[PDB]
Coordinates of C-alpha atoms and ligand atoms in Angstrom, one line a residue:
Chain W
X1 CA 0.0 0.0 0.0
X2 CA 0.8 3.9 -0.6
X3 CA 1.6 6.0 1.7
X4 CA -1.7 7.8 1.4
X5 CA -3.6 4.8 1.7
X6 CA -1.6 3.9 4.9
X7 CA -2.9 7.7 6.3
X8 CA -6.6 7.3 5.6
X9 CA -6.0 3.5 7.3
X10 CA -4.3 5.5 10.5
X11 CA -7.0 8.1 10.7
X12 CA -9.4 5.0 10.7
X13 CA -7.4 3.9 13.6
X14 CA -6.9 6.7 15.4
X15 CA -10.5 7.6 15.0
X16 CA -11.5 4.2 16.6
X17 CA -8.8 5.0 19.5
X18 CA -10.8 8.2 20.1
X19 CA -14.5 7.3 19.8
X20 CA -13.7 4.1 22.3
X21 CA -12.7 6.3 24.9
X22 CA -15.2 9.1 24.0
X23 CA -18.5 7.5 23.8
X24 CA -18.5 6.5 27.4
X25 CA -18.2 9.7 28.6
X26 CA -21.3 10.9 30.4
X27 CA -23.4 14.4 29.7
X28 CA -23.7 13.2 25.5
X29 CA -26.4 14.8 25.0
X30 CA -24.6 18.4 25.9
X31 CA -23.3 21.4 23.4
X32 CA -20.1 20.7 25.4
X33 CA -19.9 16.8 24.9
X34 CA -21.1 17.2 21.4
X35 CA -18.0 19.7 20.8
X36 CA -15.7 17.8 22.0
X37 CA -16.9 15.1 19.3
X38 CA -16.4 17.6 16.8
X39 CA -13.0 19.0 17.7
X40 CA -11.8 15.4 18.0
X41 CA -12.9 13.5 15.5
X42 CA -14.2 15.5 12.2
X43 CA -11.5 15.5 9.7
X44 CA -7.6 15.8 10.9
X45 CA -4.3 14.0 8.9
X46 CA -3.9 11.9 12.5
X47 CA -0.2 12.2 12.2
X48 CA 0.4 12.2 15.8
X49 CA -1.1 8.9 16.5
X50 CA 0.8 7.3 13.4
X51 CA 3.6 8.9 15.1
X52 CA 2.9 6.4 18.0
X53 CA 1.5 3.7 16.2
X54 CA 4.7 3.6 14.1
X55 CA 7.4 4.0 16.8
X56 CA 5.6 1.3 19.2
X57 CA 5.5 -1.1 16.3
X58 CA 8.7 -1.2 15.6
X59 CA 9.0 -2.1 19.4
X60 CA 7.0 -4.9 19.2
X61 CA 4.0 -2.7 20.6
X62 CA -0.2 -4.3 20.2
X63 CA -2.2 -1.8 18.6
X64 CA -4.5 -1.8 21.6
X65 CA -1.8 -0.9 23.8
X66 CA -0.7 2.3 21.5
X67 CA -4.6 3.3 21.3
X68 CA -3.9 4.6 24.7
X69 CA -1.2 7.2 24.0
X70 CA -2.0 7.6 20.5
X71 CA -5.5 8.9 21.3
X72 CA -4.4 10.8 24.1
X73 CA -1.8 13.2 22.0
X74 CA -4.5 13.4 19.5
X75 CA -6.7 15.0 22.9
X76 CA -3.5 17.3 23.2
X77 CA -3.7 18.0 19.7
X78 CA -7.3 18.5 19.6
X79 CA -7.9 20.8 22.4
X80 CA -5.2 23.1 21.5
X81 CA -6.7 23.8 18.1
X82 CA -9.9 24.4 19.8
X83 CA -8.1 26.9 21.7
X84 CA -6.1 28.5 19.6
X85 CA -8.7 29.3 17.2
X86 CA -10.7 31.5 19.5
X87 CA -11.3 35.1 18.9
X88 CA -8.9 36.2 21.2
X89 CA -6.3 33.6 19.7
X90 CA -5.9 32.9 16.0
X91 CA -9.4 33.8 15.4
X92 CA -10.3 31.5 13.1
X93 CA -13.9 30.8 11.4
X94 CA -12.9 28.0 9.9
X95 CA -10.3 24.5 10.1
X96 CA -11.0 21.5 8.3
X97 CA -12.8 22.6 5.7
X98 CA -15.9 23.2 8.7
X99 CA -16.3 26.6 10.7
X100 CA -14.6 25.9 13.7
X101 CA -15.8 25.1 17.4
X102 CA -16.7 28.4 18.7
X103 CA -18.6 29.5 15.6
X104 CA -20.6 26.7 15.6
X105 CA -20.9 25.8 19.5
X106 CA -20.4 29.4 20.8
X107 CA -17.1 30.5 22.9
X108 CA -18.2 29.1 26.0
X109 CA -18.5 25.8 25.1
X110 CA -15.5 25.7 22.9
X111 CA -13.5 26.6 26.4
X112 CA -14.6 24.1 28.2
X113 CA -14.6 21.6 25.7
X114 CA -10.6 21.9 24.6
X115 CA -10.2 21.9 28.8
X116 CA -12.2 18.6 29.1
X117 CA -10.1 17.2 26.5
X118 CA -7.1 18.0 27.9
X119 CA -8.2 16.2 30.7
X120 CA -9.0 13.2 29.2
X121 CA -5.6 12.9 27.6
X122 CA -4.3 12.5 31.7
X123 CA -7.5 9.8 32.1
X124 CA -6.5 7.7 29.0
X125 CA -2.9 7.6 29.9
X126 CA -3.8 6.5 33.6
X127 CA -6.6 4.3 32.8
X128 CA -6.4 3.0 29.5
X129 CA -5.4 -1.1 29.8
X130 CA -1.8 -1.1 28.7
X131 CA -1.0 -4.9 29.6
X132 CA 2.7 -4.7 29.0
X133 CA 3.2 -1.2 30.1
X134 CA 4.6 -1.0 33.7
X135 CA 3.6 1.9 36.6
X136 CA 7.0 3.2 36.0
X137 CA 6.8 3.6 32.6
X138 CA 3.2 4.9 32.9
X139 CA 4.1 7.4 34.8
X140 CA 6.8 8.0 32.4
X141 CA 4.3 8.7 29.3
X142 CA 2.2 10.7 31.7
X143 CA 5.1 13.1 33.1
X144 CA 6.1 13.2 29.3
X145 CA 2.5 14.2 27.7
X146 CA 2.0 17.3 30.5
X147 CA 5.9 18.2 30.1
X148 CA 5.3 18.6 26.3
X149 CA 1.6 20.1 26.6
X150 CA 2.7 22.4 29.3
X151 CA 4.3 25.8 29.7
X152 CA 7.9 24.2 28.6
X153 CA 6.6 22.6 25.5
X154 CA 2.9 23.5 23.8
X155 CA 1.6 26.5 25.9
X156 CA 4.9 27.5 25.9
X157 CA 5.4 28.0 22.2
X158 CA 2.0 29.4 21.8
X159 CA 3.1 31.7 24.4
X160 CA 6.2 33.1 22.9
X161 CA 4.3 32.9 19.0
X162 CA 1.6 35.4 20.5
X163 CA 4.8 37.7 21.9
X164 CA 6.1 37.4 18.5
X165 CA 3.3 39.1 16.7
X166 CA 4.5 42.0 15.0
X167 CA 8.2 41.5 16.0
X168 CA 9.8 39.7 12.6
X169 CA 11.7 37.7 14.8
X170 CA 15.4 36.1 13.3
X171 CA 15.4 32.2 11.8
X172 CA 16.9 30.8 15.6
X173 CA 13.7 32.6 17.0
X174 CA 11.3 31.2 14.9
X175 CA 12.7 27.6 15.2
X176 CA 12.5 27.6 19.1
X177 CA 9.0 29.0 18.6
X178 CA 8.4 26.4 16.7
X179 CA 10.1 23.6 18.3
X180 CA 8.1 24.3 21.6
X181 CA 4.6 25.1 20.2
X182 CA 4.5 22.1 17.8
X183 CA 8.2 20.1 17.9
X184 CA 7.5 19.2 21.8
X185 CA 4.3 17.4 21.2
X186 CA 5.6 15.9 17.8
X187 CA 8.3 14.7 20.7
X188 CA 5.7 13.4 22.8
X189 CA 4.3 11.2 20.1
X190 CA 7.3 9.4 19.2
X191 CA 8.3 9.3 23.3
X192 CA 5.3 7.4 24.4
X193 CA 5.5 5.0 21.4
X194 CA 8.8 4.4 22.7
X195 CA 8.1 4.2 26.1
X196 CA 5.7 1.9 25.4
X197 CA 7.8 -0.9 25.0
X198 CA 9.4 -0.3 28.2
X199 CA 13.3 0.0 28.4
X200 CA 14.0 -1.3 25.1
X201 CA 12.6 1.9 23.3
X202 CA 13.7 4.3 26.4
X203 CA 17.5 3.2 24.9
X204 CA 16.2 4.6 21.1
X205 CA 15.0 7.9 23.0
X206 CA 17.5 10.5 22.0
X207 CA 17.8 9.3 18.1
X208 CA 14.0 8.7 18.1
X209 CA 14.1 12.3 19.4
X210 CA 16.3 13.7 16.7
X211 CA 14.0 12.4 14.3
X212 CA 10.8 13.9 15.7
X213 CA 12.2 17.5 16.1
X214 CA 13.5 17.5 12.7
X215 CA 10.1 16.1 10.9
X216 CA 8.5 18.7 12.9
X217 CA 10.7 21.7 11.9
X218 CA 10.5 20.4 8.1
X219 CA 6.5 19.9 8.5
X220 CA 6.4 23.7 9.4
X221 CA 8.7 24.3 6.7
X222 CA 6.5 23.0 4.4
X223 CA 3.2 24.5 5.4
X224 CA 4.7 27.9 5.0
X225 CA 5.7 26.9 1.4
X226 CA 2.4 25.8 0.8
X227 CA 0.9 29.2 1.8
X228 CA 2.9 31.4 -0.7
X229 CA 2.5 28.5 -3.0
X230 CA 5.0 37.3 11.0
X231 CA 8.2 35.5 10.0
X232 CA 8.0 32.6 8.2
X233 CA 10.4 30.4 6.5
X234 CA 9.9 31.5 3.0
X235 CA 9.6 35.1 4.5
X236 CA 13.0 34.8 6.2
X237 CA 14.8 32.8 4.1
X238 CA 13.0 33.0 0.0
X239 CA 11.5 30.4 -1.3
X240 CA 14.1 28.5 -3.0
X241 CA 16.4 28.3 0.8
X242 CA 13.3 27.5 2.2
X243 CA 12.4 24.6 0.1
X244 CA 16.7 23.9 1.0
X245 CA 15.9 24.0 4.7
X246 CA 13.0 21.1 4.1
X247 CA 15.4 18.9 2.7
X248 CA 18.0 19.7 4.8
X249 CA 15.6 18.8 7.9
X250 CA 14.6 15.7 6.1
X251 CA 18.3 14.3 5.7
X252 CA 18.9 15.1 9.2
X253 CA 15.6 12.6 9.9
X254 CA 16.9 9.8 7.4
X255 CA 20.4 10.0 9.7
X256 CA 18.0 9.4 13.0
X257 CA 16.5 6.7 11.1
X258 CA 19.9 5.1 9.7
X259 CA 21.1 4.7 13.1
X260 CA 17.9 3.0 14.2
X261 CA 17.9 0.4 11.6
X262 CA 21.3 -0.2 12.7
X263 CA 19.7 -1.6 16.0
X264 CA 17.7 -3.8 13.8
X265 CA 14.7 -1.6 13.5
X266 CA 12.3 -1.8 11.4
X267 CA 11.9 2.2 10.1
X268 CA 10.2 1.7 6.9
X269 CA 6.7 3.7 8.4
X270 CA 9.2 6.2 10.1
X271 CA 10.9 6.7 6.4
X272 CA 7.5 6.5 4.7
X273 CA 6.8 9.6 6.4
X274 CA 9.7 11.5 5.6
X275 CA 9.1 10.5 2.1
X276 CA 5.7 11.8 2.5
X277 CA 6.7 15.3 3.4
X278 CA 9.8 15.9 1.1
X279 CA 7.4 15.0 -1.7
X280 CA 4.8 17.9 -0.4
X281 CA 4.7 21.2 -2.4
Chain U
X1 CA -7.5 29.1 66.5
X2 CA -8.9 27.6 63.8
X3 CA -8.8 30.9 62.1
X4 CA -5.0 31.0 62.1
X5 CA -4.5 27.2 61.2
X6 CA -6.4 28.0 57.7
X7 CA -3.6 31.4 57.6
X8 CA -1.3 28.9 58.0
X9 CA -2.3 26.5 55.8
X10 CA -2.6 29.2 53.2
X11 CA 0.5 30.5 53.4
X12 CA 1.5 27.1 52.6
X13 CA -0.2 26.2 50.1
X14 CA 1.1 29.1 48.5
X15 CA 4.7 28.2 49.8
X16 CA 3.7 24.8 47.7
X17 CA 2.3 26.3 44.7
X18 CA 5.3 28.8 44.4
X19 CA 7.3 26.1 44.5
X20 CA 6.2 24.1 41.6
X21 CA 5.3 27.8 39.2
X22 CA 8.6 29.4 39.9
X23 CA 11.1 27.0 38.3
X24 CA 9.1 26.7 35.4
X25 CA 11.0 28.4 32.1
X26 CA 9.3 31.9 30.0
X27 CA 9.0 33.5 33.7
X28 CA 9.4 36.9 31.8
X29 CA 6.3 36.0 29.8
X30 CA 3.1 37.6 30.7
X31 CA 1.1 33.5 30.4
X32 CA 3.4 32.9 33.2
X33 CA 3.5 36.3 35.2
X34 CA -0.3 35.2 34.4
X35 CA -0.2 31.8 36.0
X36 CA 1.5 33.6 38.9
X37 CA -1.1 36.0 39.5
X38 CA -3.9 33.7 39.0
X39 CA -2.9 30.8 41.4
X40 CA -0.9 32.7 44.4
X41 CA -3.4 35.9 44.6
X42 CA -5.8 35.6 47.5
X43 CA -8.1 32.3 48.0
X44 CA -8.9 30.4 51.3
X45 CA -7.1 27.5 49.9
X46 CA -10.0 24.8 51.6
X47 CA -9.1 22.1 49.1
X48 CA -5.1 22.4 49.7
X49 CA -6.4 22.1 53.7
X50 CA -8.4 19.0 52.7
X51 CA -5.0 17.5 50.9
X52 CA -3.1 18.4 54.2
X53 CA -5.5 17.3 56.8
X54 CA -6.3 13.8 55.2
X55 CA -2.3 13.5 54.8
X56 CA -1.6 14.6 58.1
X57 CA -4.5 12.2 59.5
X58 CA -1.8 9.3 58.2
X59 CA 1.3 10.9 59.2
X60 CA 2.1 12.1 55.6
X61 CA 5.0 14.6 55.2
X62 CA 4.2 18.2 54.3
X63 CA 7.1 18.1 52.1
X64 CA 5.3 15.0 50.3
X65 CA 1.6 16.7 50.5
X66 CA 2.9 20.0 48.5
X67 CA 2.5 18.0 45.2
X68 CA -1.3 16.5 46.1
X69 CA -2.2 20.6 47.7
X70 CA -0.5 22.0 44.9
X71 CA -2.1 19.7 42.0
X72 CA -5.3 20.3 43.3
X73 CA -5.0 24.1 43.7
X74 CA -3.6 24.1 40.2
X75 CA -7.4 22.8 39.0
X76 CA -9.2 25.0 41.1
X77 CA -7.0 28.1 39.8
X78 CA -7.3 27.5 36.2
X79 CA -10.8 26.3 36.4
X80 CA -11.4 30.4 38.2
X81 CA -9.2 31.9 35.5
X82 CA -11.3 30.4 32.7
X83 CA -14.6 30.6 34.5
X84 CA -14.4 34.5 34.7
X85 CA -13.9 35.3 31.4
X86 CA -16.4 37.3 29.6
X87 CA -17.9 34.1 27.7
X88 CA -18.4 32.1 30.8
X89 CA -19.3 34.2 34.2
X90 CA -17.8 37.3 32.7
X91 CA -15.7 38.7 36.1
X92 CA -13.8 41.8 36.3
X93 CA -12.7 41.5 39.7
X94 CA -12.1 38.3 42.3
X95 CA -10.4 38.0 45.4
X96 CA -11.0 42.1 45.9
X97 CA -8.7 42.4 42.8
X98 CA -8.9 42.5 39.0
X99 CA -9.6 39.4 37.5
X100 CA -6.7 37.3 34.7
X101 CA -7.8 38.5 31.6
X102 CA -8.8 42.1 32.6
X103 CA -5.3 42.7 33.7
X104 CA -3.3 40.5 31.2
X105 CA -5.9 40.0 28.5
X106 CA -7.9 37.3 27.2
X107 CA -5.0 35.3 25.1
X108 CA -3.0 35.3 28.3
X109 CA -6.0 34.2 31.1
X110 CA -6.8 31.5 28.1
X111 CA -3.3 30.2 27.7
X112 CA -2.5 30.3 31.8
X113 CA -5.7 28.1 32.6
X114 CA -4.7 25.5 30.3
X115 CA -0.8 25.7 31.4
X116 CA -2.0 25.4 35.3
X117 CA -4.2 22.5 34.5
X118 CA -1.4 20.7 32.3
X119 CA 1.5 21.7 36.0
X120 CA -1.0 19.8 37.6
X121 CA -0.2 16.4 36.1
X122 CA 3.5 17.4 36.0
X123 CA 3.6 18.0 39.9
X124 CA 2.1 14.6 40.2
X125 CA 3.8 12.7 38.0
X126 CA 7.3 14.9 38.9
X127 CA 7.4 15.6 42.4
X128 CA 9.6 13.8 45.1
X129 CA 6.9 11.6 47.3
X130 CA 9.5 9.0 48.6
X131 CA 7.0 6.9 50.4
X132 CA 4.5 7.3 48.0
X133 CA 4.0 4.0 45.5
X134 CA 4.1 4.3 42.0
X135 CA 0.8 2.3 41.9
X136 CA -0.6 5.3 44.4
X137 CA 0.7 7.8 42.5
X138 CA -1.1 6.4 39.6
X139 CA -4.1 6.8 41.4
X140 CA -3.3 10.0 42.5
X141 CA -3.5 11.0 38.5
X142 CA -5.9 9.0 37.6
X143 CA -8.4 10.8 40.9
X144 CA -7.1 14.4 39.8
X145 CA -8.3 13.6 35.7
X146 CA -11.3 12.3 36.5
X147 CA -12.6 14.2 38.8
X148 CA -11.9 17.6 36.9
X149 CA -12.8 16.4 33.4
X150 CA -16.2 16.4 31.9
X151 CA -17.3 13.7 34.2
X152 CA -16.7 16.0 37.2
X153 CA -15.6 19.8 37.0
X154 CA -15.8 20.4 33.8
X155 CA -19.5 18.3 32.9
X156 CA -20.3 20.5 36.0
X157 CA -19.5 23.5 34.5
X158 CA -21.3 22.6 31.4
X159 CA -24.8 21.3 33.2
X160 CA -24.6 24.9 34.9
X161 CA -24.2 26.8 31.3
X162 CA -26.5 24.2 29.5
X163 CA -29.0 25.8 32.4
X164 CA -28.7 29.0 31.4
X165 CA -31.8 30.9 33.2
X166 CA -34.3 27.6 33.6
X167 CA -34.8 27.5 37.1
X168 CA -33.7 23.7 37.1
X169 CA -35.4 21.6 40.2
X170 CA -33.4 20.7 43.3
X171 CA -32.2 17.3 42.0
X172 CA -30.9 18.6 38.9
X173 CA -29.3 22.0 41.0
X174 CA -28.0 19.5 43.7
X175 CA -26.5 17.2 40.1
X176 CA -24.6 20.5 39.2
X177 CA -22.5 21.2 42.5
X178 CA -22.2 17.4 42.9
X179 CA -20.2 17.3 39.6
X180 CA -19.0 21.3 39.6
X181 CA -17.6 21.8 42.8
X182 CA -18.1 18.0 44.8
X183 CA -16.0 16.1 42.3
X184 CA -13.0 18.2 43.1
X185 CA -13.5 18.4 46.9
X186 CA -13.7 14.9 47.0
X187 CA -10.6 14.6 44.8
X188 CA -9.0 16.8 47.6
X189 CA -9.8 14.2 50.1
X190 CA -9.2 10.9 48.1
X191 CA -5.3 12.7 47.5
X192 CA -4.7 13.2 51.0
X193 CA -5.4 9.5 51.7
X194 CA -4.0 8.1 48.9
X195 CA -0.2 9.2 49.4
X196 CA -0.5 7.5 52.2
X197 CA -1.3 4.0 50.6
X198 CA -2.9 1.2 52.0
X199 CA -4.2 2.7 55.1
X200 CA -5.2 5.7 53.1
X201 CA -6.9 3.7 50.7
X202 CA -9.1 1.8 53.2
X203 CA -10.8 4.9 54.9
X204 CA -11.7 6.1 51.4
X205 CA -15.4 4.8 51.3
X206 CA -15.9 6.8 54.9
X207 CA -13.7 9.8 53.6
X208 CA -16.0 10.2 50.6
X209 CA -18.7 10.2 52.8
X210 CA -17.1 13.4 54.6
X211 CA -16.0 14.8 51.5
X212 CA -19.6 14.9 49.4
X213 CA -21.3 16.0 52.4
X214 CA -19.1 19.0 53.0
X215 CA -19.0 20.1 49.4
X216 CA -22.6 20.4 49.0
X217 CA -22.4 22.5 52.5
X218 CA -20.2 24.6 51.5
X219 CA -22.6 25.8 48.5
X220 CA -25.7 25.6 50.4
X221 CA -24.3 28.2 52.9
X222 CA -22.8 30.1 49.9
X223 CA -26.3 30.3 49.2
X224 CA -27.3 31.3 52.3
X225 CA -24.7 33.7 52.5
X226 CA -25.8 35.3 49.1
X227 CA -29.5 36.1 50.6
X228 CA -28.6 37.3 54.3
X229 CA -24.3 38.1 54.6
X230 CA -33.7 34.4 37.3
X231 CA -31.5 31.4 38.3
X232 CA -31.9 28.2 40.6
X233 CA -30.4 28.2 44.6
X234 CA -31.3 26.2 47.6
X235 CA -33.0 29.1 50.0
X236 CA -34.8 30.1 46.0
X237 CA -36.1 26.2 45.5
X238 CA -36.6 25.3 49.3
X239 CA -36.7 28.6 51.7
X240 CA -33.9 30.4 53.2
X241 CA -34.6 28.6 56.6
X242 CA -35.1 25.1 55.0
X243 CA -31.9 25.7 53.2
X244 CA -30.1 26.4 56.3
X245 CA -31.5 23.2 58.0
X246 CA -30.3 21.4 54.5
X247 CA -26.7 22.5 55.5
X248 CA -27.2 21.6 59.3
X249 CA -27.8 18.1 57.9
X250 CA -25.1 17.9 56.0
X251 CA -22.7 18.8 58.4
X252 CA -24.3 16.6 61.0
X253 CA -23.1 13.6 57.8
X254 CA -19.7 14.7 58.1
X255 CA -19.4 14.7 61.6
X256 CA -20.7 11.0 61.7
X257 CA -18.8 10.0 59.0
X258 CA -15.7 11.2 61.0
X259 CA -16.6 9.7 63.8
X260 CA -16.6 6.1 62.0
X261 CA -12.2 7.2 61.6
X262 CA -12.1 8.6 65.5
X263 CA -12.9 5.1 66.1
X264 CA -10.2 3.8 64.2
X265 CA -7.3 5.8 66.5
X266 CA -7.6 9.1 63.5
X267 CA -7.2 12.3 64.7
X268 CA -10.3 13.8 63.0
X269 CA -9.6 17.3 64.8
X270 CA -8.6 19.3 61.8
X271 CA -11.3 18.1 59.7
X272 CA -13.9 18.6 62.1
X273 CA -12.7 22.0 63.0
X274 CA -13.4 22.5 59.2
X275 CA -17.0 21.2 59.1
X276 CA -17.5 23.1 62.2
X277 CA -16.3 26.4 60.3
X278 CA -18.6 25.9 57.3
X279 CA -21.7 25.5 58.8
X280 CA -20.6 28.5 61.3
X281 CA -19.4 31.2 58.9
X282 CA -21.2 34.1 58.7
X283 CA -19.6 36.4 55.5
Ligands
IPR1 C1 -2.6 23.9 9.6 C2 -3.1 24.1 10.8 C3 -3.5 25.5 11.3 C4 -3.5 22.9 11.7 C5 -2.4 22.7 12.8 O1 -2.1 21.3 13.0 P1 -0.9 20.6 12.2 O2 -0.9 21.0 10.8 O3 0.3 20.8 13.1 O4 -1.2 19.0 12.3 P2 -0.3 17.9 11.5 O5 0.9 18.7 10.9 O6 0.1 16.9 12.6 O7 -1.2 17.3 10.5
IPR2 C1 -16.8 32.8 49.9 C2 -17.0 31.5 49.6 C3 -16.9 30.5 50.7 C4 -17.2 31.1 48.2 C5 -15.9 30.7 47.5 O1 -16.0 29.4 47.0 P1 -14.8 28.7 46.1 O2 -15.4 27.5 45.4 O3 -14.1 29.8 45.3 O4 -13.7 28.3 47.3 P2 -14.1 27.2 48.4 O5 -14.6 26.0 47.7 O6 -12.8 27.1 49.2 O7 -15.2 27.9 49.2

């Protein structure tokens, strides 16, 4: 299968992950509940979830196992898209090709629904039946997820983008900015995937780490192509040194990769991706 | 002397909270100086009190109860900052001072809830508790998620909003607290008791019994309070003397419910004192 098959199969998988631990929620029946439905599980590319699918695999991970972490960075994801687009945020009236939560649920509910869905991000990891996952390394994904959602990773680059406004910050700038607003969850992905499998992928950590910041920057990279196609890459750098900086991002992920396969690992989904994002734009 | 155990306890809490804020990177950043302002300014701190009085009841270090007081507190802080903006209860001032997003803005009082509620499960997850278990701790997490999600807190919040102006009946009014404000409270509790383990974990049914009885008090009497210190409240449904009897009872619950753990060689004093205060309290 092709890469864009293996996506829609993900999404179908990740989508599954996320309804199992969404429709026994109680209050269904409420603006707020129905929300969260919405900002979870209409449209999205899933790529955080085949983030962990594909790195706990390749540990020897069940797929019921990663459902647990996969769906609860998608939560992560999900909430802080429902956040960020609020008036007083990005404002934005539409994402996904639908108007977005608070112009079709109302502020209030949008609010509360991206902070119940944080929330159940901490429940799946802390509940969800992970047979072969121990307490430590539970507690391991768990410190790992609020680390990269928190102040030093997610919030935190949300933070210093909304100081940025207006300030053309240099190319080092920007790449922290985005590092912590979208690199430290990308992080998290791969980390719980890893984690997962116990002490066997907490020795792959800082290559598996490598990889992840570098598809993230290059991801980024990409999207600002796509727009022309604030500081931004192409802004910073032109077009042509942009479309450089991709490809340069994208050889440093192969080299995370070579050294994994090195170990006997099976990166083929980890290179698929890769492969999927140089070929964009 | 009550009075100036719940100062103490406050400027502890606070001692706790600082603790896990101030080491936290972007402190020049107005989200944090945002966090900052949000959690440490003013507050009677009951549900870090509950975290140190069921820990204490079990001979639980302070040192070790700072994570539990401070998680909690971290909740309750965000769930105030986001609460008062002017799409949910739309507050300019708290605590006798302006409120997160009139003196930082809206971005920064949206961004600061969600950072305190993510500290939360860092301090638990994070934080030195040497004798606590990693099984405990576990549970510790697992309490402090449910509890403020949408099947308590936030589902409270939500059944309050969805409510909007109907004058809902006293089962459905008594459903919102219970989920709201009760959850959390009871999380408080269920903390304390856990980091101390299996002896912790064994009082828990009579604990909860404490717990949901006091947290409904507390908002009946806020009720009360409201009327003598169109929208749905106990002395509104039942009578402002009915509603006070109401309270009575549910402190008269507690106090059983304590006595159950006095006869099981637990110094109950501290949270008795505090069921005593509740019912008492007169601003
Ligand atoms: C483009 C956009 C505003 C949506 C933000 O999410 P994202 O593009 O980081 O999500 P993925 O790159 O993981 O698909
Ligand atoms: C004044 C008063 C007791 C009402 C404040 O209630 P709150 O929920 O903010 O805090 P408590 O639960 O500690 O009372």
């Amino acid at each position: 299968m092709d890469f864009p098959q293996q996506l829609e199969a993900c999404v179908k998988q990740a989508n599954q992950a996320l309804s199992r631990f969404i429709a026994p929620l109680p209050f269904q029946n409420t603006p707020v509940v129905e929300t969260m439905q919405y900002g979870a599980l209409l449209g999205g590319k899933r790529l955080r979830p085949f983030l962990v699918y594909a790195t706990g695999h390749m540990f020897g991970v069940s797929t019921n196992t990663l459902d647990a972490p996969a769906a609860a960075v998608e939560c992560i994801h999900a909430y802080s898209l429902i956040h960020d687009d609020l008036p007083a945020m990005d404002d934005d009236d539409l994402r996904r090709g639908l108007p977005t939560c608070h112009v079709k649920f109302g502020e209030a509910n949008a609010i509360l629904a991206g902070d119940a869905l944080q929330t159940l991000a901490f429940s799946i990891l802390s509940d969800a039946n992970m047979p072969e996952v121990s307490d430590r390394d539970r507690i391991s994904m768990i410190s790992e997820l609020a680390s990269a959602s928190g102040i030093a990773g997610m919030c935190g680059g949300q933070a210093l983008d909304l100081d940025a406004e207006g300030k053309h910050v240099p190319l080092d700038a920007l790449e922290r900015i985005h590092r912590h607003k979208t690199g430290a969850l990308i992080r998290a992905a791969v980390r719980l995937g890893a984690l997962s499998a116990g002490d066997k992928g907490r020795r792959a950590l800082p290559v598996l780490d490598k990889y992840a910041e570098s598809i993230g920057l290059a991801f980024q990279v990409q999207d600002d192509i796509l727009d022309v196609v604030k500081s931004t890459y192409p802004a910073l750098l032109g077009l042509e040194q942009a479309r450089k900086k991709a490809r340069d991002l994208i050889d440093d992920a192969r080299q995370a990769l070579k050294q994994l396969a090195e170990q006997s690992l099976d990166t083929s989904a980890l290179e698929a991706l890769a492969d999927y994002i140089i070929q964009r734009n």
